[PDB]
Amino acid sequence: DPAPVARALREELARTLYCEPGDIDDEASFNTLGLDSILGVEFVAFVNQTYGLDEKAGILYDHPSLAALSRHVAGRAA
Amino acid sequence: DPAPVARALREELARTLYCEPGDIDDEASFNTLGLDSILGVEFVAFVNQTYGLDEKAGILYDHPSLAALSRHVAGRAA
Amino acid sequence: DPAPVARALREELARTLYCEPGDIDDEASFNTLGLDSILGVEFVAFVNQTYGLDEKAGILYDHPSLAALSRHVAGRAA
Amino acid sequence: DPAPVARALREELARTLYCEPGDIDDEASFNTLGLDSILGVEFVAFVNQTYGLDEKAGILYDHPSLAALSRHVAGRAA
Amino acid sequence: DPAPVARALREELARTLYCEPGDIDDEASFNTLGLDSILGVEFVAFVNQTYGLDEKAGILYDHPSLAALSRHVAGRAA
Amino acid sequence: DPAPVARALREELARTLYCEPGDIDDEASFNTLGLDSILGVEFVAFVNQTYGLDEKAGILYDHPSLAALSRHVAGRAA
Amino acid sequence: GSVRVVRGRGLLRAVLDRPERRNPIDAGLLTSLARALDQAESDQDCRVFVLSSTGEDFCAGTDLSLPDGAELPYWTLLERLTRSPLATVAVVDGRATAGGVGLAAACDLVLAGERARFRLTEVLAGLVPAMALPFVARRTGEQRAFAATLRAEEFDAGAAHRVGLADLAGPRAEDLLPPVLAGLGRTDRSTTAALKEYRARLFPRDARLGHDASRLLIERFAAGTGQLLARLREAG
Amino acid sequence: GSVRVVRGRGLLRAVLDRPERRNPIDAGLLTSLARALDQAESDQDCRVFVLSSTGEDFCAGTDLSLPDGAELPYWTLLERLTRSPLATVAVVDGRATAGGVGLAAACDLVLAGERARFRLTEVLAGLVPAMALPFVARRTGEQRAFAATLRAEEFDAGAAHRVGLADLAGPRAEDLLPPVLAGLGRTDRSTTAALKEYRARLFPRDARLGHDASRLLIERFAAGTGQLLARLREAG
Amino acid sequence: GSVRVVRGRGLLRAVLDRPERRNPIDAGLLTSLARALDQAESDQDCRVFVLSSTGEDFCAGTDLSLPDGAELPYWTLLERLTRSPLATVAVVDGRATAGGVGLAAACDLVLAGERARFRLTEVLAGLVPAMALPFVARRTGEQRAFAATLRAEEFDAGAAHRVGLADLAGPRAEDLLPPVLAGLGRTDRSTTAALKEYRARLFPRDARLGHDASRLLIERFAAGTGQLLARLREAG
Amino acid sequence: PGSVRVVRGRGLLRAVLDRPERRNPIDAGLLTSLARALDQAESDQDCRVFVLSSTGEDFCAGTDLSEPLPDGAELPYWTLLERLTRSPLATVAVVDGRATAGGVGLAAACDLVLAGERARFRLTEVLAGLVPAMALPFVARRTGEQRAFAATLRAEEFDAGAAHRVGLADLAGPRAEDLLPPVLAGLGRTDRSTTAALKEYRARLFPRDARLGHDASRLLIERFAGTGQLLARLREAG
Amino acid sequence: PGSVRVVRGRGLLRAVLDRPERRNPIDAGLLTSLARALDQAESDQDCRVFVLSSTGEDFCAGTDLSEPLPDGAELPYWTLLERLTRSPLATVAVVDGRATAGGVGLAAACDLVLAGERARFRLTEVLAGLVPAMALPFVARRTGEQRAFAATLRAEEFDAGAAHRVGLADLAGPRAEDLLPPVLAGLGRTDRSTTAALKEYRARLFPRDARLGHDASRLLIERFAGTGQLLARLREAG
Amino acid sequence: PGSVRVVRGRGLLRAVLDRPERRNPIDAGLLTSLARALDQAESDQDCRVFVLSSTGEDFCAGTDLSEPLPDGAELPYWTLLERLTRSPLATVAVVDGRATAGGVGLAAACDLVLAGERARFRLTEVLAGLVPAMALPFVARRTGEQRAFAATLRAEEFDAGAAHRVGLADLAGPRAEDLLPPVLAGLGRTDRSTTAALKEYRARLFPRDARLGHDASRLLIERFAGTGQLLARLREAG
Ligand SMILES: *P(=O)(O)OCC(C)(C)[C@@H](O)C(=O)NCCC(=O)NCCS
Ligand SMILES: *P(=O)(O)OCC(C)(C)[C@@H](O)C(=O)NCCC(=O)NCCS
Ligand SMILES: *P(=O)(O)OCC(C)(C)[C@@H](O)C(=O)NCCC(=O)NCCS
Ligand SMILES: *P(=O)(O)OCC(C)(C)[C@@H](O)C(=O)NCCC(=O)NCCS
Ligand SMILES: *P(=O)(O)OCC(C)(C)[C@@H](O)C(=O)NCCC(=O)NCCS
Ligand SMILES: *P(=O)(O)OCC(C)(C)[C@@H](O)C(=O)NCCC(=O)NCCS
Ligand SMILES: [Cl-]
Ligand SMILES: [Cl-]
Ligand SMILES: [Cl-]
Ligand SMILES: [Cl-]
Ligand SMILES: [Cl-]
Ligand SMILES: [Cl-]
Ligand code: NA
Ligand code: NA
Ligand code: NA
């Protein structure tokens, strides 16, 4: 189930983008949301520190929405 | 005194403008929020129905924010 | 008969707008002629001093051409 | 000597350009007043008819103002 | 070693882009010369046919100039 | 035969315009090629010194391509 | 009352002359403009029909204060402004609202000053401006004319110029007129007549469109409309 | 799988919901969108149909991974988006490619965000986008629609806005929607229905065009095409 | 005399080659261009027909120095440039005047350089450019094509680009051609042929328009015309 | 119960002009309240951004029409505008209504100006016989000297688009408040130390001389000291 | 019977360049006649505006192609351009033809530049081996330094629209003369006292150093002193 | 076998940045090689133009992420940018790829900037905790101070069109190399003597103070001296 991860990621993204978690369309592209390559690296380093992972900054290109990133991190983490 | 009037108007404004009440700044001008003369007349007719008043559509010009209108309306209320 | 007033007003407007009295369309809006709110106040203070009146600057909004202003001042003055 | 020629041309120019003779600056270029090559040829044919001359349409290029043309024409007149 | 490969590619690029081989700067990016992803795939299929290779269309991204591609190709050649 | 003159003129024009002689369309206007009135005077002074002529700068308006200028200079020179 | 005629050199000018009522469309205006165009057309030395106005409203549209095959006089007049042998020139120095947009749009050339505004308010009243749209769409293209109707979009002089609703824009529409009149003096009435006839040959309106447009406006007006018109009234 | 429906105040939203496949057109999508439009039309209090998407692709067009008088379902759906009594609004926040351009273009209003891109790729595959072009050309004009096809021109939000393919542009198409919905609440379904019916009366498509467009796409697809599609595949 | 043909890779180029006469339209030019287009079409490996010129005049129009159902050869040629299976590309690096505007406008793509100028001078001579207008209006829209005719408006490269008369503009039209040729090499003749055939299916000219346009030009020329042509001559 | 309402967020302090019924005029209390907000922001070592926003139709109407100057002394208005250019915090003005007279300087002195649909900027000072001497250096460092002086001579009004075209606004959109989240997210990629060194270096490369704040203060006081007539005229037109 | 014709109007003096047959060149008499017009305008305490306009196709062709310099001395051209920036009168240039070489500075030094359809601006100086040192500070204070220096290096020509886009013209229209009535009516809302204090403050905030007029005068004289060849070339192209 | 390839033409020397595989970074050898090209150009009395062009997708990527400062000393980067503004040769930058960080200054310091379709300009310095102190005066003299400082604070990227609109590019087109022949033909109408006097006069009218190169050098060295973390972040995003 990706829902717990999507929540943790939605709250970090909202803080990073200076919005409320409630304003974020989980299926919107990171480009549409205005996550640049710099905040992208910080966001992936948040995912790595929070779940004990080391995913390349490149992962946001492979899974370019909150929902797609959540399934990736969900199926990866444990 | 005005805070309940302000909330009743804030919910109606939210519905007219297709946003959530929590998105509305009570101190923003009706022109900044995007209320035109047309929905302005509907909004005033709403004020009149809900509070049994007979305000002219011009009142949105005299009290051009939710805060200002809600004080004017509460002071005309029983 | 408004014609004497229209003449006195046409000559002041021409001086104010740096044109000849002959160039002024009496039925053109003050906006179309380029009378701003500042020269508008000076023009109404010309009308007041010349005819012994004290009309608000607002009068040019109520009667927004030379012809309409002339009928107002004509029917008012004596 | 040229002042009558200048006035006859000034009235014809006024009619071709839909303005009053008193609106025309004798020293303004024909290009500034808005006379194109077409009305230019009609204007030269007017000069030729009125003064019995046989000037080429190019003369508006050699004497490119009412003042300059009226001196050239008066000096070719009887 | 690469200079003959560079010339074979330079002539083909010249034909694809409707210019003379002598107009092509070997060090200019494929994006600066105006090679799109479509003619890029045709150009790679040309490289593969001429040199019996099986390069992916992505190779124009890894070696994004005539000089760079011609070194990569010559080093994969017999 | 204008071909020897067209060649001598094509080489001077290429040097003046910072191109190769081969890039010049002999029938292109000097305007299309980007010969301004200043380089035009230098180019006519090249024609004059090379062929023992003294053609006015104006000649490039009369014969406004390399081909037309070459026929003029050809039929003139000897 | 509603139109004042002024003759000039090869032109007739029809001035909308009821500024204090904002120059509304009624039977009086439409008839006085048809009669001005008749006078201009009867003078064989006339070549240009100029439509201009007074005060802050070019034309406010229908004053808010059909046999088979027949057309409303508004349709008939707009078609005449497109078919006349006279060049038709609209001078817009104030608000053109609802049917007032069609009256301008139907002239050959629209000159727009700093105070020019155009807006089809019809959908806010539950109406389709069926009679005005063909004369707007032949200028803006169908997409901008139908999206401007759905959204009741307002155009100033620059916006009207950019979308083709105005051919020329500047600080005053009246000061754009003398160079247009100077330019038209290079050609003649016979040539203007044939050009406009060929526009109708190349961009035709089918013979039933006038009736159909007139009918659609009548249906929707005869509907919930009295309320929407009050609302539009109270909004100003 | 392919469409997710969300109701709102006087609206139904159809969300293209297969971002990892780039929101391709197939029988499933076309049928799910026809069924969303049916539901929206059956609700007599519905006034707006919103088409929006997910991820980086608004719609990639035909997934690359005809009786007489009949039309392909794509044609039928595009015509419905132009003829519905509902105002149809396209929210474009990613790449609209090939048939994906027609799906947007056919809505009454196109909102385009910073990541919006439009491109007809068809001629690069040896195809004519015959079914999408009428809905593009009614917005851009015939010259820009046919030259954009020949050149497979790409439009960003600003370019799409400038040529009429987008009515509104800004940093996010979704943030342009609430003011459009607020504006449409001033009018009603009956008025929107009559406006769209009159657009079809003024800008008609002849009765055979759907079949003919469908036929031309089928012919060229049934041709050298498998190669050109591979090439288009390898280019990405 | 009037046209010089140059073959290239998948293209044939027809060069207007009478610069000292300003590249006028006569029976010789129209016949030499029809014969160039025949040669290009007969070569099954040809895909592009390029129309370019010499000196300061792209094309000055009719040199000033009809059975029933028949069309003048100018009409016939303009229609061929719109109907050919070859992509037709106009390279405009000087003045396109009167009929010279239609010759450019009728090509699929118009490239305009810094010295490109377009102007319909016809009404200044008492004529309607009836044969050139459909090819101009299919690019600019009817309003800008008819108002540019009435006003004999001149367009430079940027203005021509902004109104759709030019698809591409830059310092030299000839330097815009290689990227256009590179782009067209991605598609083929069969695909270009079907695209242009579908444009005629979607934006048709009725079968009588060629005769009617030809007739209107002949009538007005056979009229006061000899004087207006002298005047136009003396003005240069 | 003041003319500035203060709100804390993540690495920011927002000062809201909060007298819309009075059109958010400049007086003593507004300048002190703003100076005090800036002090509270700068004292928080985790604060990186100072956001200046307002209420109603008037961003800021300038000096209220409803002073001695010691040697080397500057009026508080000058002191506040300088602070907005020198603060180690990024200063962002959020403009969705009328900035008039002194209100134009207050917006212009912020690092970044966001303008919405209802934004208007106009120096009305010459219409009252005044030179806007204290605001001009903050406008001119955005517009260049010609456009700042000519806009003053003609009392030119700028909407959001025109303000953006001349440099007075850095970003324009339907609503200035909706341009703020992306500016804040972008600023979160740098830190206060860098922002401070960048503003300091702007003063180094484009300095105001040490006498300018005094001379500008003096010129405004001299002209305010027929001014009564011209201000009555201005209010009557208002 | 002079190169400047002087006309009085309501609170203005208009100096008309009146040698169209010679293309309104700059020589001694034009600079004295203009300096004398400015003197007559400034001596009338009711005068508020100096209007500079011209005749024919040439607004002003610059120095006529048809000088000792004492220490601290400036050429009269510099003196006149400075006067146009420092005069207590609003200076308005009305440009409906070619401003060439020195003609560009003469227009640029006025407070407001009005450009009509036939307006053209071009510094041809580098084509004659000259630096337009005296005009450049008056152009650069309008265009910024990059556009003024690059336009000089490339001898860039500006029509009305391009002049307006870069700041060299403040207003553009079909005819510069028809932009003048609205500028005069707007200026009638302020007075000479305010206009004077505003121009003085421009010199205070954006100064030219006291040596600049001398150094610029010297650089032009040095380069004019092969110049004969390059001027012949320039006339032949003219 | 160097980072600069040198080509001679008619009255020009072209310095080509020739390390595309490394993205044409700035290091010691690039700055010396460029300074040496400029020396060879200036020593040829027939040379009038220095052309700066590059290779691949990177015009110049800035300092390579793959220094003591004596009193009055300047880093070589500053010395080279100053030389490009003071050289008697016209300096032309030909930009058809990414100019990043220090690469923006190197282009901006040339007299004329030509930008093609693939041109991009961005100061990334604040994202690494740096102030681009040495490049800023060369950008600001083109863009004005507001746009140069704001573009730095926001790490704004400019394509060819945007660069042209703000003044950073003087000319824009499909390819910067194809804008060069017309610039060279135009420059052939003037000479080195005039070009030299014009650049000298730009320094006279718009000077940089004698301490600026030192202070700017010091500020960059101080900030480079958490920088390790922020540069790792920048490379990971690259
Ligand atoms: P970040 O927003 O600073 O951007 C850095 C960047 C390297 C991603 C970018 O500046 C760039 O040059 N490329 C833009 C396209 C992109 O995302 N990279 C393509 C990788 S598939
Ligand atoms: P409603 O929104 O349909 O109509 C209101 C109106 C047309 C009367 C309104 O647009 C109007 O005339 N407003 C005058 C207000 C004004 O000053 N304009 C705003 C720009 S500052
Ligand atoms: P004046 O030209 O200085 O203008 C002052 C003003 C208050 C009239 C104006 O700046 C303003 O804010 N409103 C513009 C619209 C208007 O005329 N007022 C609406 C009153 S109904
Ligand atoms: P007429 O006004 O119909 O035609 C005259 C013309 C077409 C010959 C004329 O436009 C022309 O070619 N003029 C050359 C003049 C010139 O230099 N252009 C004005 C811009 S500086
Ligand atoms: P091809 O030229 O038809 O298609 C290639 C593409 C559509 C995949 C390509 O446009 C793309 O998506 N590129 C990403 C490259 C990029 O960063 N854009 C260039 C601007 S910096
Ligand atoms: P050169 O490129 O410096 O141009 C000088 C010029 C006199 C030719 C030019 O600046 C001008 O004013 N006229 C442009 C039109 C032209 O070529 N002259 C018309 C003679 S028929
Ligand atoms: Cl209607
Ligand atoms: Cl299709
Ligand atoms: Cl024709
Ligand atoms: Cl102040
Ligand atoms: Cl000088
Ligand atoms: Cl640096
Ligand atoms: Na925005
Ligand atoms: Na104007
Ligand atoms: Na270019």
Numbering used by the authors:
A (entry chain C), B (entry chain D), C (entry chain C), D (entry chain D), E (entry chain D), F (entry chain C): 6835 to 6912
G (entry chain B), H (entry chain B), I (entry chain B): -1 to 63, 72 to 229, 231 to 243
J (entry chain A), K (entry chain A), L (entry chain A): -2 to 63, 70 to 228, 231 to 243
Paper text:
During biosynthesis by multi-modular trans-AT polyketide synthases, polyketide structural space can be expanded by conversion of initially-formed electrophilic β-ketones into β-alkyl groups. These multi-step transformations are catalysed by 3-hydroxy-3-methylgluratryl synthase cassettes of enzymes. In this work, we investigated the β-methylation module 5 present in the virginiamycin (Vir) trans-AT PKS-NRPS, which comprises a KS domain and tandem ACPs (ACP5a and ACP5b). We show here that β-methylation cassette members VirC, VirD and VirE do indeed preferentially recognise ACP5b, even when the ACP is excised from its modular context, and that β-modification occurs within defined ACP5b/partner complexes.
Instead, the crystal structure of the holo-ACP5b–VirD complex identifies an ACP interaction motif centred on the phosphopantetheine (Ppant) prosthetic arm and surrounding secondary structural elements, with specificity conferred via distinctive electrostatic surface features of the domain combined with precise Ppant positioning. As evidenced by the H3 crystal symmetry, VirD forms characteristic homotrimeric disks, two of which are stacked, with six ACPs distributed equatorially at the interface between the trimers. In this arrangement, the smallest gap between S6871 of ACP5b bearing the Ppant (∼20 Å) and the catalytic E128 of a VirD monomer is ca. 13.9 Å, with the other VirD active sites more than 33.8 Å distant. VirD elements contributing to the interface include the β-strand β10 and the subsequent loop (β10–α4) of one monomer, and the β-turn (β1–β2), the loop (α1–β4) and helix α7 of a second monomer. Notably, the interface also incorporates the well-folded helix α10 of the first monomer, which is disordered in the structure of VirD alone. Concerning the ACP, the interaction involves the C-terminal portion of helix α1, the adjacent loop (α1–α2) and the N-terminal regions of helices α2 and α3. The structure of the complex also identifies key interactions between VirD and the Ppant tethered to S6871 of ACP5b (the distal end of which is not visible in the electron density), consistent with its contribution to binding affinity as observed by fluorescence quenching. Specifically, R125 of VirD, whose side chain is oriented by a water molecule, forms a salt bridge with the Ppant phosphate. Gratifyingly, close inspection of the holo-ACP5b–VirD complex structure identified ACP5b N6865 located in the α1–α2 loop as a potential specificity determinant.
